Structures are given as C-alpha cells and as structure tokens.
Design an enzyme around this catalytic site. Structure first.
Site, PDB file in Angstrom:
ATOM      1  N   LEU B  11      13.252   8.843  21.022  1.00 14.85           N
ATOM      2  CA  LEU B  11      14.210   8.751  19.859  1.00 14.85           C
ATOM      3  C   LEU B  11      14.147   7.493  18.907  1.00 14.85           C
ATOM      4  O   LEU B  11      14.447   7.602  17.727  1.00 14.85           O
ATOM      5  CB  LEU B  11      15.645   8.995  20.293  1.00 14.85           C
ATOM      6  N   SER B  12      13.857   6.311  19.449  1.00 10.53           N
ATOM      7  CA  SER B  12      13.701   5.061  18.658  1.00 10.53           C
ATOM      8  C   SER B  12      12.511   5.127  17.711  1.00 10.53           C
ATOM      9  O   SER B  12      11.385   5.365  18.146  1.00 10.53           O
ATOM     10  CB  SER B  12      13.602   3.885  19.590  1.00 10.53           C
ATOM     11  N   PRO B  13      12.760   5.032  16.382  1.00 10.06           N
ATOM     12  CA  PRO B  13      11.590   5.049  15.390  1.00 10.06           C
ATOM     13  C   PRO B  13      10.510   3.955  15.626  1.00 10.06           C
ATOM     14  O   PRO B  13       9.349   4.280  15.628  1.00 10.06           O
ATOM     15  CB  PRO B  13      12.226   4.926  14.020  1.00 10.06           C
TER      16      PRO B  13
END
Lengths: 220, 218
Positions: B11-13
């Site tokens: 989920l973390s870009p």
C-alpha cells in the site's frame, strides 16, 4: 563562461546553492527572478524551467533546475574533493536520504505554510500547518545523531536543511529546550565565514517578510 | 552475501517505487511487513532502526538506508548492469535528480497532505485547498513530460517515484484525461512493463480505495 544562477536571495532553495558555491569557492553570476512580480511566469523563464521555480543553473549551455540537483552537480563538477557529496555509495545514500527528507518533509511543510500567505492572500497559519512543521522539527532533531544531518562531516544536505530551517523558525517557533540538537547544529553552521551572506540574512529576512505579509493580508 | 531486506508495505507508494526498481534490476527483496495502520513502525525496534519512523527501509547486509529515493539510487549504483536507470553523466544525472526531488517535494508531499489526515487523524473531507494543490502538481508533472519519460527519452527510477505516487492519488483526486494527455500516454508506457501491475499498479489502485473507504468516517 562563469556559472549563472537564476535566483532570489529570499528563496530557500536559492540560498542552499549559494552556500554550496561558497563552500566550493565558486563565484556565481546572480540574475534575479522576482517571484512577487511573476518574473518566473514570464515566457523566457518558462522556457528554462516548465516548473517555473528557482534556482536555475546555467553553466555555458547546461541548464539544471532544482536546488538539490544543482548542488549535486556543482560538487561533482567542481569539488576539489568529495566531502560535500560522498562518492562512496553507502556514504552517499545517507546524504541522499537527508536531501530527500529536506525536499519531502522540511521544505514541503514550509511551503504548505508560506505559499498561501505570500501568494494566495492568506492571513492565518492553520493549526495543521503548525503541527506538520513542529513534526518536521522533531524529525530533524532525531536525524541529528551525528554533528551534521548525514554524518560527522558537513554536506550539501546541511545547506539544504539550514536554508529551510532558518526561514520557517522565525515564523513557527522552534522551542530550544525541546530541540537542543538542532540549535547546536545551527551554531556549527553559523561558524562558517560565508554563513551570514549566503544564508542567515535571507532566512531571517524571509521569516519577517512572511509575518509582515500576513499582518498585511488581514487588512485589505 | 545476504539477500536484500526491505521493511515495507505494499500500500505505501514509496515502497512500490523501490519494488519497481528491484523488479527492473532483476533483484529479489525479502519483504518484512511494517503495517502502519496497526502502529508497527512506532514499535521500539523499528524506531531504533529508523529514527524518522517511515518505510521503506533497506537492510543491505547491515547497511541500513531509509528513504525510498536514496534506496533506488544505491540499488541502481551498486547493482545496475548499466546506468540506464540512473545516468552517470552529470547532466543527464541532474535531470533525473531534479525529477526525483520534484517527486518528493511536490507529488508525494501533497499526496501525503491529503491522505495522511484522512488515514491517521480522523478527517473526512478533502478541502478545495488540497485538491487545487494536487491538481497544480498534475500540471507541473504534465509540464515536465516533454519527452516520453519523466526525466527524458528513457525510463529512470524517477519514473518509478512519480508513478507510484500518481497511481495512488488519481483514484481520490481525479486526474482528468483531457487536461493531461502526456501523463496518460506516460501511465500507458508504464503499464507496458510486465512487472508493473505486480510491483505497483494494484497497490496504488488499492491505496486510492482505502482512502475513499476510510473517508467514510462521517
């Protein structure tokens, strides 16, 4: 041909580079780009930089936008040694991390505070702007386990951080009892022969300006 | 030696910017999951590992690099077969270090201004002040894509940073297609990598969804 900087001394990323020049013994030809009057939105500078930001470097043909890149490039081309920007990958990654921390946290939060005041007519510092900036101060104090942001040796990452911090602290109070590492660090950078001229006066003066500019937006 | 260890969350870009980078370089990470929404980055071990409590974090045989862009630079430098992802030429290098810094200072930062208050502080609007802010960054990124890739004729790690951010935030603050043809044509180039959907696309698309789902805390 001499290096040219399109620049404004009030500008933090502008002063980052000025510190670097100084540290390298490089003599920059400054050409002013007054953002208050839209110099940067003018078609000739939009040609140099589609992001219409300063500083812009022109080195006899080569145009480099973005303070952190111009700083990398100046050290790479002109440094007589690499202290300001390590060639060793591991050492260079600690500088890089602190350069991107500065871009992505410290300056980005400062801009989120300053830009609406200086350009969008705004007269408040919202409480959430404040917390983001106060959180950015703590993040920096925790990054200073050594004497300088990316190690025991001073780097362009320090110029980058100081140029920002010295601007925003005259607007969003940096409590000294809570940030002794930052203050001891500012103290180190102030010892530099070229510190008042390349940075300390424009930082101080931008802080005061943002504050004047905001007393001013409350009225008319 | 030891394998590459990334402390990460799909989920973390910025994690995905590093994933795309590993994938392109033929590298193979050992993901150790650091789940922000249950506070795993504030865990005492990790806080000692990463003072700034962020991810990704690279463990490379005990060398610890925090900060995705420095990670992607290290990995290209030390393990690239060529300087294709990060040019060694000072001038083409500078173009890439400018896009990378545009990336943390503009694209990512304004996405965090929007996303963080929603996912972490209980907030439920996106003020027109935030929207306008991200749209102005769509526009700066469109202005920048005067070649096929963000930092010129050829795809760099700079294109990995931008897309990883642009793919999360499009689904929340619409990236309108008539206005940004270069960006869209460029997203289209990125989706033409076989490892794109895996290392990036899906998690970006699901970062969008999780923000909209979590916003519904009215």
């Amino acid at each position: 041909s001499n290096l040219v900087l399109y620049t404004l001394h009030l500008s933090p990323p502008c002063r980052a580079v000025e510190l670097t020049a100084k540290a390298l013994g490089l003599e920059l030809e400054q050409k002013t780009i007054n953002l208050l009057t839209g110099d940067h939105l003018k078609p000739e500078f939009v040609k140099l930089n589609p992001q219409h930001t300063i500083p812009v470097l022109d080195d006899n043909g080569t145009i480099i936008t973005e303070s952190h890149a111009i700083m990398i490039y100046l050290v790479t081309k002109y440094g007589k040694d690499d202290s300001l920007y390590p060639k060793d990958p591991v050492k260079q990654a600690r500088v890089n991390s602190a350069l991107h921390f500065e871009s992505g946290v410290l300056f980005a939060r400062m801009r989120f505070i300053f830009e609406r005041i200086l350009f969008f007519g705004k007269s408040d510092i919202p409480e959430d702007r404040v917390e983001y900036v106060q959180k950015s101060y703590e993040l920096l104090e925790d990054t200073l386990v050594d004497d300088f942001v990316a190690g025991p040796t001073m780097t362009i990452a320090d110029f980058s951080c100081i140029s920002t911090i010295s601007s925003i602290m005259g607007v969003v109070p940096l409590e000294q009892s809570k940030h002794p590492r930052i203050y001891a660090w500012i103290d180190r950078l102030k010892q530099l022969p070229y510190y008042e001229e390349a940075n300390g006066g424009g930082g101080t003066d931008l802080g005061k300006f943002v504050l004047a500019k905001k007393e001013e937006n409350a009225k008319a």
